[PDB]
């Protein structure tokens, strides 16, 4: 337990002691609330304390007697909600009981108080939600009603309302709940609110959705009044725009009006009675019936024509007759018509009754009835969608009529929106575009923007139209003469809140600026200022600012800058008053400074300073209104200026930290909310300044680390500020080569971060950002960990993972957990202990003890190491037992009374902890291996099957863990999935999701398990044949179709996505299609096209199905509906890139080239075109955009456009530049398309280009044209980037003079701003570099523009696309030697060396793979070609500087792409052989393999992705081979990645060809690598990768190369012959040679023949122990290791020697027999490898001691025992070795007798001396204890030897040896002899 | 000691977990009491986050008598050096109102709310202590 704040007690006593007397009760309760808030890190504990102290009786009496006090309600709600949170986590049933019984009544009393305050509602709502989760829900009915009353009160925040209406809806699902609502005010209450106080915000729509869901359910218990239908309809007309609401209204009506009523009305209308009677009545009824979309069809069956009848004949003539009456009828009809234009089939009906004419003519009459005209306008929009129909409509001049009317009648709100809607859907058609433009054009629509500025729809329509029209404008006159610019500025100015319309407004201001006579009308400043202001209000909106800088770049003048800058200080001095004045100047400065040409003025006057000083003057002063605002602005103004500028920032950074630490900051922020105040704005700003990495200088840096620490010291309680600070530390830490860590060390910053994390454990945001800062530094400096352990970072790490079942966190807290990692031996210790304790509790039937200890053990497996250890310690086998015990000891668990968890809870909890353990272990490849091998997939299936009966508290918790451990295992081994695939298990799994029908994790993991086993077509057929699975499909579709929860629908869809995506089988797709998914999913996109999450998720699933299914089938082979729907989503979703991607994907699968007419008619191509333009930089949009346009006949269109370009150039028209520009636009989209016959489609490319280069030369400085020509050239080049024989690509560009043209333009510095040119221009240059025949010309023209290329990178340093394009160019260009010289000797300046500039840009865009990948690839390419062309190594790569910066640019969550680039960079440095010292120092090879092993563990990437990493890594290792860096590898077992590549990717040939090549290169390099290749790798190739080697040409050839290398050395041939599988592969290669024939096959056959000959011919002589000695001895004297674990050649050497010796050792040898002389070398051999402690274990795993000792006892010849002695002597240099030998019983007596034998011998003195020194050395070594030799005559032999020295027999050396032995064996027992 | 931001240490070192060895480093609150010898010094401690830490110590210390004392000592000190006599303050606010009257006579509104608070309230207010 954690202890509660002590103040809780005092607070509570206050609340209890004063429940009558209110003034203080509130005070106390306000204080309890504050203790009970997430501000405090102990609110849960605080909450429970109050409960146990019985505070709720007091809160209960309080809220009854003082019902009214809104403030008591807020406090009460807060404490209870806090209790709710605690009892949910602390699952104590008693506490859950108490809060149910004693707590819910008060929450209820709060809700029946009818509160409007968001917080009190959120809380009591969140209270209700948590209690349900705890398993003690609050009766919906009780809350219903009180919840309705909330709407009796207005002033209700739409956000809160949206939540309440959702909650009413769930309550209404019961008749009980629905009646409660009827008993209180019925539908009216809600509906009235909706009508009166309802808005059209995305929230408001979600609110009304829930209101309509409420009603629906109420109408199905007849709890509906009679006000409902009229009101519902009123509410639908209010929301008609938004289809999600319209649909939920219709659904509600259908539950209220049965089909019988339809029948009645319709037939009654067939019973004529025309004229009042029941006809004109039923007529009114039909009106209503129309709204019910489910009845639209039946209405069309018998009717649809009556309507036009009632319009034309029955009204047009009599219009002049009876205006008022006629009008009403006309309208009602027209509207119904609009309402029934649902499906394309329905609009079909309409044209069959000539609706277009009738309606078109009606307009001509209803020129005076606004109402009727709008009704017509409304009934036309659906018709005017169609193109064929639109041309009819211009022949009626109806556009030409409605436009002028709108203009004059715009103030009237109905007609405006409805006319505009029509002009809008009209403007989508090129033919009309012109017609309109002619008649008063959009000079009226521009003006019209000035009105209805709050009507998003209206404004949207209008501006979308104007953006379809102003392109085709010659002059800006008129629009000015009318005052339309001034009207769009109005719209913009009035829409600070609608990000959407605000965007469009400036896009249109942007587009106005592209007209020729723009300046003439847009240099008033008015516009300038508007855009500037728009820009600062809408910061976070990328597209808006970019569009604004463009507009400004065009019309802004320094004459505008001074008009602001010359009043700056005056405005700052007068900021207390007129804060709006200075607000403007700030916004101007902020914006105009993103224009590179203009920033200089501000730079010169040092405005940033002037502003920073103002900020200070605005804080350290008497507070004033507008203070916060102007400050927050100024902060941004300063931030932006620096960001668009180029200086170092360290000054400004400090200035900002200084501002944040001004004393008055606290007082200024207390009138604000805690995460939008001048403090967080400042911490945000400076963080952003750090991101730029422009903090350079070890002094300059210290300042910043200090300044940030101060900020966090002054303001402990501003959580957002602390976060922004932590984040900021990170960027700083990795500054100045990453040296920052050192500073942070010295400054004490690290301990700060640790002590924050410890102090605020509850804030994950903080936990992650904090440990992030830690992990970063750890990865940049060693010993950082020391400090961390010394700072108790462990205590933190633990409570982190122990309070966060998350992921990203764990990922971050991993490197620490490997540095701190505890003693690690301790982890091991504890893990073994806990396993034993778990096993004991099973053997002893202590169910509680098992639970307690499993949970303990689960706390140690959160670590990659924990898991890896548990595997080694046999957790798999243990789990089998734990499971067996649990399953068969349930009723034991149930009976337990004396434990924290009791009842089923205990049982389920224990399975849960059991499954969890396995889930966790399976986080690692090791773990999955061990788990699987132990049968643990069955174990899990047994656990899962153990859960049943009353869902317990942990039942779900338990299911989730079982299913997740299963998911991981089945996904990770195909065989293991395929073994599990049994009908019964499928049934278990399906039934599982029924048991937890509302659990999304259960459904997710179940579906993953299912898909993972359906690994082949047959299994899919079998899985789909299971009724339980078909039911599941039917059920998933059901949720998608009916469940009003957005989150449910998403989950049901993600579940389908996974079944079809993993399985990727047509049969799956077909079953899902047949369960109704296709139509359900399309319906999502129809109703929710305005919801990105939904639209995307639906499109993703539609797209997968679409690969297999012809989606028209589900619409009776009419494409129109699915097309219409997708086109409309693409419209609404145009700016969201991932949404257009997936929509375009569906369109491309839906449609065929046989649908052109259809696709013209529904305007699909227009939208695709526009999507491509908006997302020009997107690989996927362009590609899919291309595939769609290929259905329109691209081959022909390219031919056509290309010919038109040529013709218009040769005409010399005045229009020419603009005409060629539009043509290039069009040509560029088609060039995205794949072609049937490129040689025919592209035939005119070169001439066309010639025409275009001429055009540019003629008309310079045409920004649009420059871009489109470049775009054209890019797409041309891209089509064939890699085919150097293609003539239409880089070839055409270079031969046409276009390449030299572009080079010139950059060199002319005239285009260094047209980002729309530079991008594709540099891609074009890239393509010319990549084409080898173009490369000489690139080199020719490059010197002209390379210097400027540097300038661009500095100028557009903040634009990531531009940087990537240019860095990509440098990368491709650096493949040429001469080019490499130019780069390094032409690209320097402020940012510095090109390599420096590259790091600077990478560091700035760490989040952008495109920049970082291009960056790293460049560095490597440059590094290599330089080394090859003589240049000396880049210095800043060689000092490790850049290797580190690159290492820091890898996140824990880094793409496969970035990992690949990083390898490529290192591959190239290794191939350069120039940077080996630096690569070794940074442990580059190690860190790459760590990255990769980590990735094999967590399996974050796909299989295709990891395959590619392994292939790449192989190549790294081959480079390492060629650079002589084997040995660095055998440090960290680098060979192992090659073995792993074969095992996981033996079936993938693009890996294996690399593995083969890498093995060959590694072998040539290193004799040990060779050995491993033979003994370990080739066995694995010939089995696991045999199928690849025999069926893929390159695998076969590479494998034969590898073999040929291996057999070239003596001994290898023989071994390779024994390899199992080799033969099968070799003859399969043979067969692959026969198949290919020609030259390739001949040489392949010959390769295998040579291999076979080399293997037969490999005949090494029998080897002798003497060879073993000669190799070791030579190794030794050249200082090479002789540790077996480190040197692979030695393993075979030591094992021959063990065995050869052992057969020798059974005979009595002679020092003069060949055999016995060889036995000496064998011991000298042993002597040398017993000199390295490393070899001890292995040696003693052959009882080395025993063998040696035996020889000493047995053998007769003194000279063979000598060498056993010398060798064992050396062995016992090491303490454990000694101990062992000594322990061996007999040892002392035995070696002692060896001494005697020699002392008694008649050997010559010189020989006796050598023998005795050896023997006495052995006794010295083996006498580990002075007592060991007690029972022995050693002292006599030593003494005897002494007395022989005395007789002049020996030298002094002996005495020394005797004296050494004596001192080791002297004891009580030898005193006599001495 | 001021020139090298010593207050940065005396603020930090005082916010820690408690424990008998650390209760002693918090006894180093004394160090802070002995250094803060004037008004200017009290304000320097505040500018270093003194007020927020002392508050956080006082509030955690119900069951820590030794540090409760040492920390209340520090705060009483801070208050003392920053709080003026009710009289001087009363005088200050009368004056403020006088100025107000003068301008109006020539040209009656209220003194600036914050200026008025600044003159009338004790050190707690000047040092940025809030009601809660």
Residue numbers in the entry:
A (entry chain A): 7 to 1880
B (entry chain A): 2193 to 2210, 2213 to 2301, 2324 to 2348
Question: What's the paper's own text on this?
Answer:
The glideosome-associated connector (GAC) protein is a central bridging component of the gliding machinery. This large protein composed of numerous armadillo repeats (ARMs) is highly conserved throughout the Apicomplexa phylum and links F-actin to the TRAP/MIC family of surface adhesins at the plasma membrane, which targets host cell ligands and mediates adherent anchor points. GAC facilitates the association of actin filaments with surface transmembrane adhesins and the efficient transmission of the force generated by myosin translocation of actin to the cell surface substrate.
Well-diffracting and reproducible crystals were obtained at pH 5 for native full-length TgGAC. The structure was solved by multiple-wavelength anomalous dispersion (MAD) to 2.7 Å resolution with an Rfree of 26%. The electron density for residues 7–2504 was of sufficient quality to facilitate modelling for these residues. The remaining electron density showed evidence of peptide backbone but could not be confidently modelled and refined, indicating a degree of conformational flexibility for residues 2505–2639. RI (residues 1–1665) comprises 37 consecutive AHRs of approximately 40 residues long that are supercoiled into a three-layer pyramid structure. RII comprises 16 canonical armadillo repeats (AHR38-53) and forms a superhelical arch that contacts the base of the RI pyramid helical regions. This interface encompasses a surface area of 1550 Å2, with AHR1 and AHR17-18 from RI forming one side while AHR48-50 from RII form the other. The interface comprises several prominent electrostatic interactions (K2254-D11, E2436-H24, D2330-R629, D2346-K672, and D2197-R716). Remarkably, the overall architecture of the predicted structures is very similar to that observed in the crystal structure of TgGAC, as it is characterised by a series of tandem AHRs that are supercoiled into a large ring and is closed by specific interactions between N- and C-terminal AHRs.
